[PDB]
Amino acid sequence: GDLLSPDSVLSCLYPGDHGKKTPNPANQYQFDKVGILSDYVLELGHPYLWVQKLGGLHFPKEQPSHMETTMKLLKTRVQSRLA
């Protein structure tokens, strides 16, 4: 079924993160400004947290060498799904 389907292969590399909610709350204010979402997530892509940690953007979490670790977790995830 949904093992190698491109929607939810990499949903929970880190524990949780849900694949759905936007990381920064300024996006929530900007959505509330123009009156406007998982359809847009499936259309454009999943905004995970580790993607933005690799991109350089640091956003505050709700409760108070990344590259090699994320690529190794991708290597483990692909082998686990194929197995």
Binding site: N24, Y29, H58, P64
Partner: protein, 45 residues
Amino acid sequence: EYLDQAHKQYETARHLPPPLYVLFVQATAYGQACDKTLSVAIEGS
């Protein structure tokens, strides 16, 4: 910057109480979203 501080503010805001941390996060979000005429800071030890 004359021609960062947000990381130092996050390392300070690690120690905030949870209502104060929620106020800090929402105030920074509203300051970066719509109104740039707003500034927040953390005072304490």
